[PDB]
Design a protein around this ligand. Structure first.
Ligand SMILES: Nc1ncnc2c1ncn2[C@@H]1O[C@H](COP(=O)(O)O)[C@@H](O)[C@H]1O
Ligand SMILES: [Mg+2]
Length: 487
């Protein structure tokens, strides 16, 4: 009956040890800890963005004005509110103000195609009030009296899902609080620290940097767009800004490694890089530690948006120089299982599909159908019935050093990543062919870091590029638009 029924006692025992991850965290709930920091450290720098730096006192005052504005416009607790994801100060007042109002934020890239923004607002049930007026200039006010309700939704974040089928992941407070406690404790986040935010607010590694900063008194430092596409400049910016903690996707880190090998870097203030997204190898991380002079350690993480940013972690050993880096052990209060096509727990060493349980799970998606397809219930061990999120990722349980660890093995479908962004190449196919004048087109992955398109048409590449930005997010516009006589 159970999922582990066919396993031998040793195989069962390995999974039981792997998922022995309960941990109790103290203090009040997440927003109360944010307010406590603001009360105790009003003068500390809370956010450093392209147009200046706000103290905790000022960030919370601006957020209070957002919350009062929302209430005055009939936005009651439990609503969803879009925020414009930029690299300036305003989005931070917006997102904090939304939470202070008892609401959840949905981050929107104001440069994204209008059609896609429209879907997000509709699917998220979100008001655009804060997209249409500067949140940072709203009339000053005290924060409205919002009662505490447990496990309020905090954000809805969209992932590409399938073509024509964006998925809005609904994340509630207990998951975000658990994640925040983990970031702070695992990486020793302290009030003097400076947490860089590489990901835009539309991608969930930003959550991992923003809330641990504000829950400790540290400074959130947004990484400017003009340094991200220049890896050499990014390395010098990390030095100049004295950054202590940094989020990176694997493919972006590979560009940094290449820049570091071209000009080795000293980063004495950097202590943690929380890195993940794609498989990488000890021959790469060994190269990194040779050319980056820094105490910085690489914490490899894995996990879908549907399970609160990360689900597993592995501290990368700098001395190892070959083999695949494992994705590691579950975060506190997470449990993960490798299941075969029938739903039985795989023995150690056998590749199965990852199913995730525990404190990090999303409420679900905004859409009921997507929720019913991915979230289910299963008795994995005798007496343990789990709510599970089905990931579509493949992995196997292995011995690494003297403990069990998951090792990533790929996916069950054709989803791939380009410069660290999920892509269905068919979606890019359909966009280019939809441009009037384009007769046919084929989009190919070049690297990891390059999307190359060959197209038959009477339209010059510069003009096709202009048409595609109106239709695709910028990161899905192919890097090379090559006109060909025939494919
Ligand atoms: N450390 C990793 N190694 C390999 N694949 C990963 C890793 N982290 C995330 N992924 C993949 O990227 C998907 C989305 O996760 P994320 O990029 O963290 O939002 C996952 O479902 C996996 O397919
Ligand atoms: Mg993740």
């Amino acid at each position: 009956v159970t999922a582990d029924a066919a396993l031998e006692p040793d195989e069962r025992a390995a999974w039981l040890a792997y998922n022995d991850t309960a941990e109790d965290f103290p203090g009040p709930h997440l927003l109360a800890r944010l307010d406590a920091v603001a009360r105790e450290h009003p003068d500390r720098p809370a956010v450093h963005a392209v147009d200046g730096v706000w103290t905790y006192r000022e960030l919370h005052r601006r957020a209070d004005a957002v919350a009062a504005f929302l209430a005055a416009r009939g936005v009651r607790p439990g609503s969803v509110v879009a925020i414009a994801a930029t690299r300036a100060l305003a989005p931070y007042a917006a997102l904090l103000g939304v939470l202070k109002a008892g609401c959840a934020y949905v981050p929107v890239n104001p440069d994204d195609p209008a059609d896609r923004v429209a879907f997000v607002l509709a699917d998220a049930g979100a008001t655009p009030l804060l997209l249409d007026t500067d949140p940072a200039s709203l009339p000053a006010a005290p924060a409205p009296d919002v009662p505490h309700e447990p496990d309020r939704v905090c954000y809805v974040i969209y992932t590409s899902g399938s073509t024509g089928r964006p998925k809005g992941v609904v994340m509630a407070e207990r998951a975000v609080d658990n994640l925040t406690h983990w970031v702070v404790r695992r990486h020793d986040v302290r009030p003097d620290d400076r947490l860089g935010q590489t990901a835009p607010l539309t991608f969930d590694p930003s959550v991992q940097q923003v809330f641990p900063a504000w829950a400790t008194g540290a400074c959130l430092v947004t990484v400017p767009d003009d340094v991200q596409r220049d890896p050499a400049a990014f390395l010098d910016w990390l030095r100049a800004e004295r950054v202590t903690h940094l989020d990176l996707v694997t493919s972006h880190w590979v560009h940094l490694l290449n820049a570091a090998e071209a000009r080795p870097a000293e980063l004495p203030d950097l202590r943690w890089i929380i890195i993940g997204g794609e498989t990488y190898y000890y021959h790469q991380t060994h190269r990194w530690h040779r050319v980056v002079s820094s105490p910085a350690r690489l914490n490899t993480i894995y996990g879908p948006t549907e399970a609160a940013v990360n689900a597993t972690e592995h501290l990368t050993e700098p001395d190892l120089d070959h083999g695949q880096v494992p994705i590691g052990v579950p975060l506190p209060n997470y449990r993960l299982y490798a299941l075969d096509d029938d739903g039985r727990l795989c023995p150690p060493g056998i590749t199965g599909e990852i199913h995730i349980a525990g404190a990090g799970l999303a409420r679900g998606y905004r859409s009921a159908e997507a929720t019913a397809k991915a979230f289910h219930e299963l008795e994995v061990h005798s007496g343990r019935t789990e709510r599970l999120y089905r990931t579509g990722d493949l992995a196997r349980l292995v011995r690494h050093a003297d403990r069990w660890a998951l090792e990533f093995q790929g996916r069950v479908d054709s989803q791939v990543k380009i410069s660290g962004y999920r892509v269905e190449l068919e979606e890019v196919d359909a966009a280019v062919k939809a441009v009037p004048g384009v007769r046919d087109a084929a989009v190919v992955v070049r690297g990891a870091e390059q999307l190359v398109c060959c197209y038959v048409g009477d339209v010059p590449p510069d003009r096709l590029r202009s048409r595609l930005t109106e239709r695709l997010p910028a990161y899905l516009v192919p890097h090379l638009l090559v006109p060909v006589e025939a494919l």
